[PDB]
Symmetry: C5
Subunit: 346 residues, 5 copies
Amino acid sequence: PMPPSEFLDKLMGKVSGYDARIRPNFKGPPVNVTCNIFINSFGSIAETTMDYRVNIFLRQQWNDPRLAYSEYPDDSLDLDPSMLDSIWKPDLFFANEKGANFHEVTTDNKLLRISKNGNVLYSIRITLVLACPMDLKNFPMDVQTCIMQLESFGYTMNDLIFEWDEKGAVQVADGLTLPQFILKEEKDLRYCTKHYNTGKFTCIEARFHLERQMGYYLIQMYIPSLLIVILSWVSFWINMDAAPARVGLGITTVLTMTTQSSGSRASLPKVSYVKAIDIWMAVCLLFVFSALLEYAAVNFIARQHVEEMRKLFISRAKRIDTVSRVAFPLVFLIFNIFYWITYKII
Amino acid sequence: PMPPSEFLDKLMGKVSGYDARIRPNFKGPPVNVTCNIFINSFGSIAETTMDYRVNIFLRQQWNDPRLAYSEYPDDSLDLDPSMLDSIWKPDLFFANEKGANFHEVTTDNKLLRISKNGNVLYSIRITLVLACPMDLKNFPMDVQTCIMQLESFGYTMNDLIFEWDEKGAVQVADGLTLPQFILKEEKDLRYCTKHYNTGKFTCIEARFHLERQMGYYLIQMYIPSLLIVILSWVSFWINMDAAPARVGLGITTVLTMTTQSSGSRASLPKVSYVKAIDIWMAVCLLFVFSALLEYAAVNFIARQHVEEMRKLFISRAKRIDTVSRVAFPLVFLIFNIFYWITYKII
Amino acid sequence: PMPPSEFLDKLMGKVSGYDARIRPNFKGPPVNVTCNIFINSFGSIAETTMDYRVNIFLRQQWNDPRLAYSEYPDDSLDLDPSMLDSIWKPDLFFANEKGANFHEVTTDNKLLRISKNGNVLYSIRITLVLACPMDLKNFPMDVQTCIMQLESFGYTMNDLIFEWDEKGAVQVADGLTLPQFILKEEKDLRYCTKHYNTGKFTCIEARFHLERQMGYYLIQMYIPSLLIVILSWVSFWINMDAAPARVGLGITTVLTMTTQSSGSRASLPKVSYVKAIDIWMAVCLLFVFSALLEYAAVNFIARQHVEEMRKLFISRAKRIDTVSRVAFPLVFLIFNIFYWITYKII
Amino acid sequence: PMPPSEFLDKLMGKVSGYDARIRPNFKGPPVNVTCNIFINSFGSIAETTMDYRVNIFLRQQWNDPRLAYSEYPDDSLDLDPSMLDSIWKPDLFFANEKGANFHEVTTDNKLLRISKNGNVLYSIRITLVLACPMDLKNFPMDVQTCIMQLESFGYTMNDLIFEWDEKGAVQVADGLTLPQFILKEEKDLRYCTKHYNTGKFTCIEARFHLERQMGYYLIQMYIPSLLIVILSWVSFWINMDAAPARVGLGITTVLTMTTQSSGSRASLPKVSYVKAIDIWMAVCLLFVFSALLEYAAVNFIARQHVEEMRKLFISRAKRIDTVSRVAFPLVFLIFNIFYWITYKII
Amino acid sequence: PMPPSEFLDKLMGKVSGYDARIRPNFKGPPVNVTCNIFINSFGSIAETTMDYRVNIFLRQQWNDPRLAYSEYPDDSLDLDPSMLDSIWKPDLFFANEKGANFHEVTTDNKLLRISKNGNVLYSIRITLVLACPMDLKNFPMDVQTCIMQLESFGYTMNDLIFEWDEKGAVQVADGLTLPQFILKEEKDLRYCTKHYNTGKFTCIEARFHLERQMGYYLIQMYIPSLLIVILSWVSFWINMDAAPARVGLGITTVLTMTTQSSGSRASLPKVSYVKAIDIWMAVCLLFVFSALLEYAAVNFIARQHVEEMRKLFISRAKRIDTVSRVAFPLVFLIFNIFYWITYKII
Ligand SMILES: *[C@@H]1O[C@H](CO)[C@@H](O[C@@H]2O[C@H](CO)[C@@H](O[C@@H]3O[C@H](CO)[C@@H](O)[C@H](O)[C@@H]3O)[C@H](O)[C@H]2NC(C)=O)[C@H](O)[C@H]1NC(C)=O
Ligand SMILES: *[C@@H]1O[C@H](CO)[C@@H](O[C@@H]2O[C@H](CO)[C@@H](O[C@@H]3O[C@H](CO)[C@@H](O)[C@H](O)[C@@H]3O)[C@H](O)[C@H]2NC(C)=O)[C@H](O)[C@H]1NC(C)=O
Ligand SMILES: *[C@@H]1O[C@H](CO)[C@@H](O[C@@H]2O[C@H](CO)[C@@H](O[C@@H]3O[C@H](CO)[C@@H](O)[C@H](O)[C@@H]3O)[C@H](O)[C@H]2NC(C)=O)[C@H](O)[C@H]1NC(C)=O
Ligand SMILES: *[C@@H]1O[C@H](CO)[C@@H](O[C@@H]2O[C@H](CO)[C@@H](O[C@@H]3O[C@H](CO)[C@@H](O)[C@H](O)[C@@H]3O)[C@H](O)[C@H]2NC(C)=O)[C@H](O)[C@H]1NC(C)=O
Ligand SMILES: *[C@@H]1O[C@H](CO)[C@@H](O[C@@H]2O[C@H](CO)[C@@H](O[C@@H]3O[C@H](CO)[C@@H](O)[C@H](O)[C@@H]3O)[C@H](O)[C@H]2NC(C)=O)[C@H](O)[C@H]1NC(C)=O
């Protein structure tokens, strides 16, 4: 008969003595707020900034005995967010925020509904740009575990407790795709219970394994590196004599490997430790100098040589011939079987 | 006689028992909110970010029996947005927001007017920066269908229903032009009715086919690629002997194709799958190495050759002559008829 | 005697029945709001974004009979913007906003004063970043007409009318200078009266012819293009024989024209249609390949040639001599008289 | 005895008839607001945007007879900014704002204190990003005078007057250092009294001479330009004959001068008029083409030459020898004494 | 029995005469606010902008005798930030702000709790982007001391005093890692007590030594510089005669050192004084010109030389031989022992 907000106005109002400023079960057990998120959007992972943008549905669940209606014959009683500040709320935040906001588009995107026993369902939409450290040892082949963590600010452990729910504590959007990564489904859930001069505080937290898209930097960086190496070697399938063609076909290959290495570290954070993309290419550098080393190996022996003079020269021109046809691919094929296997097991 | 806002103040006020917190037809049928948009501005499609900026007029239409005036002799009774919060509103949002705002320029750009039976016309102006996935298989020749979707947050399906109206549910500005695309007029309208732990919620949604401007990357990337290919071949219309002109005219063409390929993938998202612009140019790469392959084919046979020695050499210098005048354009003209036809049918 | 705000408090207050929510002359003629702007700042025209930042003084003028004081012996009665929301205001906005704001620096920069008959002077300061389409056919020599337009949102035509005033409807700052353009003084003023499913709405609008600064891209792009063309031709004033100097002085000129063309389209929106800066330079490209075409024209005839063999060769070496000294400048001087005259009349 | 805010609450409250909406000395003399600023931070001068970020302490001083307490035995009575809106304030703004804000960090950074006679001390903290035109005729050697100006918005001249105070009207931070400039201590203070259709308004304004750091572009642009010029000339200290070393050492110098000129105008606004950095380098361009001009001067005379043929050739090879050893430095040393002296007197 | 906020409502309310506008111990001693921070996040040090982003927990501690409850049997009485504005707060700010904000994510991240004697614990979360000057004399090997400073705005020294606490006045996060630096644990704490026309104000301040990650620019800039120097010298281990290989292997090394120097100063602020990275590379420039100087030293003596003519030439070809094998590494090995030792002691 009576409208429920009118019933709610005398429920949580000054009548019935309800305060919005006091936690439920005060002078009693700590409040167990169980939670789960629905990731709407995810990504734009600025590895320069070492962070990621994510848009979630933060769902929060707890119970208030002060809000347990009895006579009203329904189960879930919703509330437009005008009266949302009139009730108690948790002091949730993120320990790795780096910028966030609500979404006031047409409405404060804020859900409330209350069970008969006062089980409080609370859902809001938050866009987060969460910082995460980026271990880039095997940089195109890393599985980044960028995390997120949810803590209480005023209420300590003894008055409030965050929880994950057991039934799928991270719901994921169906077409949630990543331009550069794959979100693995296994999402670790644990506690990061802090300690301060103030004291200790609750923390639930989530972990997100992100295996990359290997094929991109394969296309951009590996394959143009791959061409020059064979291009360095057909520059040994070049003519018998020390020609200016041997001069030109050598230096052309070297500058492109410098050029690809210039554009290699274009969007990278400036980590001290060596990553995987440069040792791919610095080896390709020291391979591409060997051809110019090989020409001077021809050129110094050509100047070393006139019967007996050139007799040693053309003999050494064959020891440089039949070995380099074998030694060039062998040092490169032994490189990849040395290279990829560590990056295949990690 | 009495001013209408004064009539409206006792209409929707505390007198006549009107609440802003309760949906119309409560404990009854779900509210059918029909809607249509007027796209003022559209574009700045950051394909790096895979999104698009759009400025709309979100028009919303429904009915409230609580707001049905009877005695007042007019039809549409407007309202400046001061009293807009005093009435019920829907909980509309976007499932792919990525940033939005209202427009408070001189006035909250918010329209209300009410029919005699309380049919509520509601219009606001929103700038959106809506995310959309970007399939870039045929990257200069794709028809991108970037979408947008409109959902309820608190009210489920059983209490609220979004609708498109039949009479032109997306109105488009007249001079709405795109710097890189064409908005096709056919705009698909359907439902994206979600399901959650909370439950199910209404969704109407719109789809926007965007065929590009083919001619730009034609000018920037195809035509400078086109010049080098013929420039590679007049470098076979070069002199009889293995000259340093054959050395210089070969390597000049190769580095520019590397240079255009460096500036090719300038503003591109890092997708794993191969797009169309690189297979345009990687083929142009492997074409441009064939000329340097052709010089060494001349150079190795020149070193292979003295009567019978040069007799085979000049004979092979003609088998490299009359075939390459035929084989060069034929492998390229067969490429484009292999290339464009798939990109002409999609 | 009594202070005027105290006189104003009983003027526009609840006493004397004044509403801020009702337009003047309600149930009567539409309100004629005449307006004019003072452009404080203007520019930073992001042609990539196809917009321009402008900071204006939006002056608005109309009349309210409800605000016509009688007994107070003065003419213009100002008001600090605290009481500005207490009166009626128009629902002005911009149809091409793309971001705007007010200016709360030390004070809401909001002017009100009221005549004896209630003629309302209303002035505020707005920074706008207004979108404008950019026709770039003659890109360094275009006169861009970037516009701005001012519409009503809730009030239709029959209740409200925007106007320009006759007496200089766009006031311009004195030292309002542009880094890349010239604002022509002639500013077209007309109507963009829209029509919707809602109905029709008033619009006044202004137009701004912007002729560029021609001399910049002259310096950056024309003059370095100009040097290579003569540098291509002194490479024909080179020695008699087909030298490696003819090889080196040719390819040096070609790569710089590629290099300038790489930096040519640095900050340009990706329009499909051809602009003027590339046809300046693509012609400079096909001129610079003619010198390498000319060397191979020497080189093929040098290999074509031994008495009668070289007799034709040196004769053709003179037909390539005396014609190219004439044919080189003539095709370029006929180009500019073909080029600039269309760009001098538009 | 009684707390002073309680004394202030009945001082400026509704009792004693104080209005915040009325200027002091109303229906009397115009209010003389004297002011001075303390520049906390200054710089990040985006010459592309032609503006500068500055963070100030805007101190404002005037007198209110309505706020002159009498009985309270102290001199300066401060006020936390909660009651700051309860009093009158000036309508100060900036005519060249381009974005600004207050600073609500832990507190509205807003100072009030009141003398016994009601002399009002008012100080706030503002970060400004102030636009300034950038005359770049002598671009590395200009003294930029970027200004700032402070005007009233509603109150005209006859009701309000801004002033500088005599005692150091611009206080400057001690370690206020600039990454690219030097703030000269002489700061011009004058009036920019505007005139409008509304009328005339007060303006005080400040001027800031900014002499650059000459040594940076000296290091980046002058010194690498300086090396090539001598590198062009040791390429004339090259061997007797027209060698391919003369070919290679010429073109190497030319492309670097193109390369430095490409990176020269990296961060520059696109002004039409010629600046100083390009005439530094375009002269360095036309110097570096003279060496390739000198080789062809050798090469054409080498092809011109066989007893009497080479006799003129080696004689002209000495007229090109002994003159160019003198003519090369002389045209460059006469250039700098032509160059720097205008840039030393301005 | 009675809830504590209800006890707090009559504690700090209008009853018991509590004002939020008056400092504690008014007309008495200055308030000693001791403080300490917990750095949550730190970094993204934009050396171009000369600043750093930091996210802190600003903890503030003082005492209010007005807030000393007596009868309530507990020690720390917390308060959700709704009633936070109802009490007195300090006027803290930062003198080097450059942008800051609070964090309203789900809750104003604002902590209050009050001891029995009214010792006020106050903690909030602030993200700061704090400016700091960047001395870049030894640019890859500098220890940057970027500071932060905390001042009062309205309250002077005689009414308010900031303090550090003795017990670890800067708490640091455990996994607080830097992408480019190391935060040294020693953090200097002192006073920056300002003086103005207003007067003098309290200041506590903190200092943060930041030693870089040396290994990055080692990898990016030192090692590619290191390769060319040996590559310059094997270009002297080249053949006996003045070959075009000596021409080509010289100029290839020079342009890469120009290319690395172009990408060297990519992200650097434009300081006038010379840094350490360029004197690393300008020496590498003047080393790499010596090889081309060495070829012309060969080439001029080759043209100087026919019995006695070449007899001096091959003798000078040995004085250029046996010295340069010794003189090349010696001038470079003496450089590094001159270089690094100053950068090892600072
Ligand atoms: C939130 O969840 C926590 C975790 O279960 C609850 O704390 C637990 O509360 C129960 C009953 O209140 C305690 O059980 C009792 O333990 C004593 C001693 O172990 C035993 O003698 C009794 O027979 C009884 O089983 C339990 O110890 C306690 N655990 C902890 C770690 O505190 C808490 O009550 C929940 N609060 C709310 C508001 O739901
Ligand atoms: C919003 O639109 C929906 C869709 O039409 C409306 O729901 C429909 O309401 C009508 C009448 O209220 C229902 O018709 C009735 O159906 C029963 C059983 O089918 C039949 O025996 C009756 O004779 C009568 O025709 C219809 O079933 C129902 N459809 C659905 C899917 O619920 C709704 O009433 C509209 N609400 C408002 C506020 O306009
Ligand atoms: C705002 O300006 C418009 C444009 O002038 C005003 O509308 C005009 O109002 C006048 C008098 O109210 C109308 O004149 C009358 O017209 C009738 C029929 O044409 C004629 O028989 C009468 O003798 C008289 O001249 C005029 O038609 C009308 N024009 C339009 C287009 O509506 C309007 O009144 C102004 N409103 C305010 C508040 O100033
Ligand atoms: C703010 O400063 C201005 C500038 O001094 C003040 O205006 C000046 O006010 C004085 C006295 O009120 C005027 O002096 C009188 O001038 C008349 C005619 O010149 C003379 O016959 C009298 O004997 C007396 O000296 C002075 O003219 C006037 N100047 C101007 C330019 O208006 C103003 O009063 C100050 N206002 C406040 C609130 O401090
Ligand atoms: C905040 O801390 C300051 C620093 O200690 C306190 O100021 C100090 O207050 C004490 C007692 O109020 C003063 O001691 C007295 O000094 C006089 C003269 O030196 C001496 O004759 C007395 O026997 C007594 O020892 C002390 O001088 C004073 N120091 C300064 C620099 O002012 C202040 O009281 C503290 N305020 C609060 C609210 O805690």
